[PDB]
Structures are given as C-alpha cells and as structure tokens.
C-alpha cells in the first residue's frame with residue numbers, strides 16, 4: 248500500500264507511536280497508581296490488539312529505512328518469530344483483560360513489555 | 374493518557390497517518406484498477422473502523438497544537454457532530470464491506486472521503 252519506502256517507514260513509526268500509547272497508558276493501572284476498571288482495560292487491550300498486528304506488513308520488501316536494521320530483511324524468519332511471539336504475548340494480555348483478572352493482567356503486561364524490548368534490542372537502530 | 378500536549382498532537386497525527394493509509398489504499402479497488410477481494414476489504418475496513426475512533430480522544434482539554442484549529446475546542450459540540458458523522462459514514466462503509474457489495478462500497482467510500490475533507494476544511498490549519 249506504499250507508494251515509496253518512506254511511506255512504509257512513516258506508517259510503521261505511526262503504528263509504533265499508537266502501540267506505545269495504548270500499552271504505556273496502562274502502566275499506572277498495573278502499578279495500582281490508577282484504578283482498575285475491567286471494562287475500560289478490556290476495551291483498551293482490544294485497541295492494542297488491533298494495532299499490534301499492523302507494523303509487520305510495513306517492513307515489506309524495499310521498505311528499508313528509518314531506525315529499522317537490515318537484519319530485519321536478511322533474517323526474515325527470525326524477525327517473523329519475534330513479531331509472532333510478541334502477538335502471542337498480546338493474546339495472553341487480551342485473555343487477562345477479557346477475564347477481568349488483574350493479577351493476570353500485571354503478569355501479561357510485563358511479558359509484552361519484555362517482548363517489545365527484545366525486538367528493539369536486536370532490530371532497532373540506536 | 375498524554376503527559377504533555379505534544380504527546381496528544383503526536384498521537385492524533387499518527388492515528389490520522391494510519392487512517393489515511395487504510396482508507397487510501399482502497400482507492401485502486403474502488404476505481405477497479407486493482408481486484409476486489411471481499412474478504413481482504415472486509416478485514417481492511419475492520420482495521421479502519423478501529424482506527425477512525427481514535428483521533429477524537431486526543432483533542433482533550435489542554436491538547437491544543439499541531440495543525441488543529443482552536444475552533445475545535447471553542448465549538449466542542451460542532452466538532453463532535455463532525456467526528457460522529459464521519460464515524461457514521463465509517464459504519465456505512467463497514468456494512469458495505471461486510472456485505473461484499475462493491476457498488477455499495479464505492480458509494481460509501483466517497484461519502485467517507487467527503488467527510489474527511491469537510492472536517493479538514495473547517496478544523497485543520499492550512
């Protein structure tokens with residue numbers, strides 16, 4: 248869907264911006280600093296679920312650029328494992344939110360965050 | 374969810390970037406220049422539906438900036454009418470996509486696009 252590689256870079260950076268917001272805005276909830284409203288979190292995690300599927304299609308062939316490492320493309324199966332595993336952790340977060348289980352939400356949230364960082368460590372330029 | 378107004382501006386601009394992509398990538402389909410696969414479009418419109426609900430919460434009080442006109446805040450009910458009407462046109466696009474009806478998709482797409490432009494004309498800085 249991208250006329251030029253720059254359009255794919257802009258897309259995936261904007262998807263990442265929205266994922267950071269929808270994930271990070273839950274930090275105070277998981278820490279107990281903000282109240283836990285199960286319906287509010289359920290809805291927010293449903294938005295995060297949608298968004299967390301979106302970046303990967305914007306690392307298509309010829310879309311090199313931004314702060315994306317070339318090893319994303321040369322190790323295609325390894326980068327795929329990482330994004331699929333990240334979305335597996337999103338599924339776990341969804342299950343916790345849908346159940347209304349806060350303890351499970353805490354745990355799942357931590358696992359999601361670790362998966363974000365693991366990918367950036369390997370595949371995002373400093 | 375925004376620590377500073379700049380964070381709200383960044384969010385709503387990124388949401389708009391993703392909506393432009395998910396809406397605009399259908400132009401060749403509606404024009405017949407690309408093939409119509411009902412399931413593909415159904416899925417894409419479900420992403421657009423999610424995204425098209427997101428900007429409005431990021432024009433919260435104190436989030437003035439970017440290319441957003443102050444009349445967004447001083448005429449709160451009028452700006453609300455416009456975003457609600459835009460999401461009504463999104464619902465119509467969803468119904469067309471879910472039905473697998475291309476002619477209906479064409480028409481709905483045009484109506485959505487007109488609603489984007491009507492809001493920008495009144496509420497986005499040149």
Ligand code: HEC
Nearest residue numbers: 260263266267270312313314315329330333363366370371
């Ligand atoms: C690989 C499988 C990743 C996972 C999982 C996550 N991110 Fe990511 N992120 C990745 C790359 C390769 C890039 C660089 C994109 C580019 O072309 O520049 C990014 C970038 C971000 C950014 C910065 C966006 C920008 O302003 O330019 C943010 C804020 C970000 N990523 C956040 C983020 C979060 C919150 C994640 C888990 C919920 C997450 N990322 C996962 C690769 C990958």
Ligand code: HEC
Nearest residue numbers: 386389392393396438439440441455456459489492496497
């Ligand atoms: C008001 C109810 C709007 C509707 C409906 C749509 N848009 Fe919008 N858009 C609006 C404003 C007030 C702004 C400025 C935001 C800011 O603070 O700068 C925008 C911005 C955009 C942009 C530019 C984003 C950027 O790169 O900075 C784009 C690409 C955009 N809008 C696209 C877009 C599309 C495709 C829409 C219909 C599907 C749409 N907008 C509707 C206000 C409103």
